[PDB]
Structures are given as structure tokens and as C-alpha cells.
Subunit: 243 residues, 4 copies
């Protein structure tokens, strides 16, 4: 998270951290608890080579990474079959927890949004995660979960920006319909926020508009952060997740 | 070049080295002389952002990189407008030299293939360049130009290979028609060979079949090196390159 | 600490972490509270050049580094004047806290040994710290204080060990009288434990035998960790820290 | 070499490069040809662990490192027995080549100084090598041999300077009599020059005054490069080298 602040203990109870097995259970991506036994994250986080569930683990909302851990095994990993590389979209994936988690005031699902919901500029939206605080600047210990309000923009506007100072023809589309852009030169996601949630408060309710997909610009002018637009994938998501 | 050998001083008089100014005029990609004043290379080598001409120089055939540099200025950089990323093809570009080069026996142009040429498996082909000799193993000094013979395969055969061990659905195509695959677990291009030539001898003549596009495999099984199929872009090349 | 275990919340209440300000107050050396207002550490930790007091903080006993910090400012830094380099001894220093500290069973001083006290072999001693767990293997987060019991050995035995596999002359002393060696190929101190305590329980009382001086062996055979012999510098220490 | 320039091809015919077998025959230290079959260098270059002669070769004067290697085997290495660490001196060693070298105008020995020559300030002296051109800045390809004129200073003044900004007591000697200091804040040796020569022109003849010993300062104010004073070791040298 670039340009944000440490999150209040009470915020984002659906924020999760995906851990892979190395010298320790190291965070490699973020994700969200959309259902008691399901986690929404990014495809690029799980691929490219199919992984062994024994190596992955899910950690629930935690003020400080690695402190009070309690890893959870995963029974199933589903990566959208259209996914091949971030720049061509379909960067979304699901993790089936091994068993439901005890939902409480401190830990629960986030509501997915209505298919009709586009998220026009002005909508108050925040990205959260344990990513770098700047280009090649890791989140320093004790690793507080951070958040940052980011302006959301329309795809065609984002597409125009991406062509600025680039060789790519104006007529070739960079930003796809299954993507959503947010952030400016001072506020953005950054390395390690991938898979995590972009949430907007609509009618007093928090909805997950996106899944951090491209988090490497770290607030780079004319290259806002790119997110997988959840509305575009509800049917796929509901093909595996209930309620 | 992974698994090759140093090239004979007489071979590949079309090979060029693209240099960017850092503490010195450092090699960052290969290229090929296709006309006395035109160099053929990969688009991703010049991208993403539009580059200023004054930061780039071209170096003609050298047995050893950096030893006898005679850097040449570039007057025009033309990146294919369809190019955005390696995985979506159109990875090709042209550099117009500020001046034409003195053609001789040590240095001359390589011939482009007939639009009809498909370079089917079993065809005798070589990849050349100053790229790494293995993963995370840079070409050691004195940086001899290397070469390695590679088995060119068919697109669908490559497409299939790329799906092995991948979440990507056999439904979605990975290898496009403007791409060409070659190399195996022993012979392949590697980091730094990018933009260089893949040439094959056809009926007694060397023809440039491809341009190194994806060289990060370095002989990784089932992920062979990907090249830009030159036949596919002859129209686009001839719009700029005469003779 | 190599081959040790996480330490119980109740053990080693005199352990301290020295922080230098960078992107965050990063741990660079250990130390021991030996008086309500004085910390004992290694001279090589504060040198080579004189340091700005403001760049230094002291963190008292803590189970996990960074998680519950209560950084304390230092009023004086006193490096033993005889110190030039580790290998020539006198690797010892004193930090006078800006203010005395409240003592509890969780945080209190460690007693220095009597001038005559000797820690012959077979004697049970422990070394604690937040240093690497192995060569180039940083202690992973949440950085629990680690501990390990180490065999104290006889200098001449240590001196001879250090001459094994080296060109240095058998007749040239490597291990000085103000030094003391402990550890073996399985248990030892490692990068980052420097400045910390080597304590041995004697007559039912914990006494600090040494200060980690040379901790880069990380359980290397024939290169056991070297500590500064606290007894040797009792006079100097006493000339600054009362009682 | 810091603040220096490329050496004319006709200069320093005695410079040598010591190579260690890694991915290629890599330079790890300089040295000088002091006799058709003997090379003078620094002990620290050859240790600490005893080296296997199979992994070592000597390369005679070359204008550009690695470009025209003709590696030479070594039959014997003699590390001064008093050597332990650079800071305590005796940093000197000898390498006996398997065969004498044919001496030509391009490659020949450097003369050792008379026991009485003290090389006072003002003497015109030069240090040569292929080390870094500044702190953490490697000499770039094509790796020209570099040279730089350095002002020689008196041992006691050098010793005084090394105590400025240091905790080390003025009564503790840093610069020993077997040491010699040269260089200033703009001109000096740098990492990789170690082992190479410090030569001064005396009465129209080049005499090797020192062996680069401490070369990590790279023109750090009040921390001039330290060299092993050759006259101090003439006897040890002549015990092995003929003529």
C-alpha cells in the first residue's frame, strides 16, 4: 500500500494473507473471505505452475503479519481457466478453506456486489494489504495492515492514460472490460497487495469491487493500479461459491 | 544462449548489439541487420515507454562484446503498433540507422523469408546472441557471441506443451500464429538474446525465421523459447524497409 | 542463534536489542542490562566511527522484535579505547541509558562474574539473541528471541582449532586472554547476536561470562564463536557502572 | 583504482592478475612479476582457507582483462606466516610459477627497493589494477588496466588521520612499521586492486614500494589506502626468490 496508513483494528475483517512454505510461512499475496469456506484472490498469485495444497495456507485478519498466526489448510484451489497473464485479464481465483471459520465482529465475509454495479468515479474506495510501501520498499516490521483511499476511474479513461507515453497504438485496447482501474500518483497498491481487496462503500454497505491484479506501478503516473472487476466474474464465482 | 558454443568469426555477420547508456554502453538486446540502414529487433526491447533516441546505440558484429566498440546512432525507432506485451504477439520493431553501414564479408544483411515459408520441424536452425548461458548465469567475459542449434516445432505442438502443468484451459490458445517455437531442455535462448535472430538454412541460404521474443525460459522443459514469426510481418516491415 | 529454540517469556530478562534508525528502528546488535541504567555490549557494534547518539535506541527484553517496542534513548556511549578490531580483543562497550529503568521479574539486570571466576569446559552456558539462525538465514518473523546452550572450551584448545586449515603460524596467537570460545558445529551464535550475553549458571546464580564478539562462524567446524571475557574488563566496567 | 585513468599499453609490464576458477577464470586480486618465476601479492588474497593450486592461475600484463588470456599454472604459494588479518600487517605472499616467463619489453619484472629507501612524501608513486572505480562501482567492460598517481604520506601522520572520527585511543597504533599509506580523498586503490603494486620512480627507476593491502576505502577522507611496505619484507622475500 502506497500513501496509506495503518488500518484500524476494527476495519476490513475480510482481509486475508496467503502463505507459502519456505523457511517460514511467508506472505506472498492477499485475498478476501467472501464466504465462510471460500477465499477470493488473484489467479496470478497461484500460478503459473499448479501448486501442491500442502504448501499453501490462509491466515485471517491480523493487525500485524506473522505475530498471532493460526494457519488454515486449504482443501481446494480453483484458478480461472481463461487466466494466462495479468495483462489479458481473468486474473481471479478461489481457495476453498478446509473447514468453515468462526465468523465474528472481528472476522467475516465481505459482500460481493450486484452485477449491475459499475463503480463510477467519486465512489469512496479503499485498497488494503501488506504490500510494499513504495517501489522496492518493503512494508517494515511489525508489518501493520495498511489501507489507502484510491480514486476509481472509468476503463476508457484508464485506457487512454495507459497509451500516454507508450508505443502501443491508440486503437489497441490495454484495459479490458473485466478490469477496473484505481489510484493516482500518490495513493495506490504496491508489490505484495496482489490478490487483496478493493472495497467501496455503497449505500452504507461495503462491496468488493476488485481483486488487486497489477500492483507493481506503486503509484506511477498514467499507470494506475489495475484490479480484476468482480462484477464481471460473479457467474464464475457463483459456480463454486454458495449463498 | 543455453547449451551452445562460441561462434566462428565468419558466422552471423548480421548480428548486432543494442546498447543503452548506463556507466557504460551496456548490451540489453540483440538485433539483426536486414538492410544497410535497417536493424530488425523485438518491440519489447525498446518498450514499454517511448525511448529517447540519444540513449541508444547500435553495435555491429563483434566476436567479443565491448572489446572493439564502434557505436552507431539511430535516427528512427519504429515499434509495431499492435505490441503491448510478449504474450500477445506483434513483438517486433525496426531501427533506422542514422547512416547506412559499409557492407562487407564480416558484416552484411541476413535475408528475410518468403511469406510462404513455414519453417516446419526438422529444419536446421540457429539462435545467436550474448544472452545468459543458463538461468541467472550471465555470459562470462570476454563475452563471446554464442550460437546453438535448436529444434523448431509446430505451433499446436508448442501450444500443447505450454498447457502442460498449467491452470490455463486447453480451451485458450497460448501460442499465436505470429509466434514460432524452438529449442528444448538442452538448447535454447536465454535472458539477453531477445531481439536477436533465429535463422535457418533453406535450400542453401540462411533466412531469418524469427526474432527472439521470449528468452526467459533458458531451456525450461515444455516452455520452449518463443520467437516472432518473421513471415507474419513482412508487409509491415516492407512498409519501412526498401530493397 | 544456530540450533537453539525460542526462549520462554520468563528467561533472560536482561537481554536488550540495539536499534539504529533507518526505514524503521532496525536491530543491529544485542546487549545486556547490567545495571538499571547501563547496557553492556560489543565495541565493534558501535564503531568503527563515532556515532550520533540520536541514531541509537535501546529496546529492553521483548519476546518478538518490533512487535511491542518501547525504544529508549541513550545518554552516553563508551567504547573501550583499546578496541580497533575484533580479532585484537577489547571488543566491549557500555551504553548509559538516558534514564534508569524499573525492575521486574520480566526485566532486570544480570550479575557480572567475580574477577577470579573461570568458566572451565563442561560448564553449562547459554547464548541468546536475535541473530541469524544459520549462514545467510535471517531469523524469520515474528523474530522470537532465541537461545542455545553452548560448550565453553579452553582457549589453547580454541587457539589450536583456529590454526587448523589456515596459513597462520602455530606460534602466532589468534585467541587472546581477554577472549573465550564456546559453541560447536551444531550450536552457536550467528550474525546479529553480536553484543549480546553468554550466561552461565553458577552456584545457582546467572553470571555473564562474555559478550558475543565474533559471531560470523554460525556453527562452523573449528571456528567456534568468540566472546569477550567479561572478567578481564571488570575494572573498566566498574570504572563506569557503580555496584 | 579511483580517480585514475586507463594505463598506456607501454606502462607497468609487471602487473599481474590472479584468477580463481569459478564460472570462468575470474580476477580476485592483482600481483606483480618480481622475478621470471615469481609473483608478489597480498596474503589476504590467498586466504584464509588453504587454496587448491588447481583452481588458481596467473595472467600476465593484459591491456583488457579477460580478452587475451594465456593463463599460467602455479607450483607453489607462500603466505607470510605472521599473517592473520590485514589490520595486523604482514599482508604479503609469493607465487612460484610452474615455468619462468619469457621476459619481453611488454612483460618483465619490477625491481624491489633497497632496504634503506623510505619513500617520503613527494615521491611520485602510482598504483595500478583492475579493481572498482569507486565504492560499489565495478570497473566496466572492456576492463582496461587503470592507473593513478597517489601521494605517499608518513606512517605517523597516516596513523593520526586514522584515529580522527574513531573511538580507538590515540595511544593504540593502527599503522604499523611494515605498513605504508598513500592516496587522498580523490585518488586511491579500490576493491579488487588488492595484491597489486604501488611503484615509485626513484632516480629514473621504478621500484615497488608496496603491495595493495587495504583497498576498501576507495578515497575515503582520513582513511588512505594501506599497503604492505616491501622493504620491511625483503629478507623474507629473498629467502625464496633468487637473483
Amino acid at each position: 500500500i502506497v500513501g496509506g496508513q495503518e488500518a484500524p483494528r476494527s476495519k476490513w475483517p475480510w482481509q486475508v494473507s496467503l502463505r507459502v512454505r519456505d523457511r517460514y510461512w511467508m506472505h506472498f499475496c492477499g485475498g478476501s473471505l467472501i464466504h465462510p469456506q471460500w477465499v477470493l484472490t488473484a489467479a496470478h498469485c497461484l500460478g503459473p505452475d499448479v501448486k501442491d495444497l500442502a504448501t499453501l495456507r490462509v491466515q485471517l485478519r491480523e493487525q500485524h503479519l506473522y505475530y498471532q498466526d493460526q494457519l488454515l489448510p486449504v482443501s481446494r484451489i480453483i484458478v480461472h481457466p481463461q487466466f494466462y497473464i495479468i495483462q489479458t485479464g481473468a486474473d481471479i481465483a478461489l481457495l476453498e478453506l478446509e473447514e468453515p471459520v468462526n465468523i465474528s465482529s472481528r472476522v467475516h465475509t465481505v459482500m460481493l456486489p450486484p452485477a449491475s454495479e459499475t463503480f463510477p468515479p467519486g465512489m469512496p474506495c479503499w485498497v488494503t494489504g501488506w504490500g510494499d510501501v513504495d517501489n522496492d520498499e518493503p512494508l517494515p516490521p511489525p508489518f501493520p495492515l495498511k489501507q489507502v483511499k484510491v480514486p476509481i476511474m472509468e476503463n476508457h479513461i484508464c485506457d487512454a492514460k495507459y497509451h500516454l507515453g507508450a508505443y502501443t497504438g491508440d486503437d489497441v485496447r490495454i484495459i479490458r472490460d473485466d478490469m477496473l482501474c484505481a489510484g493516482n500518483s500518490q495513493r495506490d497498491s504496491c508489490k505484495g497487495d496482489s490478490g487483496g481487496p478493493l472495497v467501496c462503500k455503497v449505500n452504507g454497505t461495503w462491496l468488493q469491487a476488485g481483486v488487486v491484479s497489477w500492483d507493481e506501478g506503486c503509484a506511477q503516473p498514467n499507470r494506475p493500479g489495475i484490479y480484476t472487476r468482480v462484477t464481471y466474474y460473479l457467474d464464475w464465482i457463483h459456480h463454486y461459491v454458495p449463498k
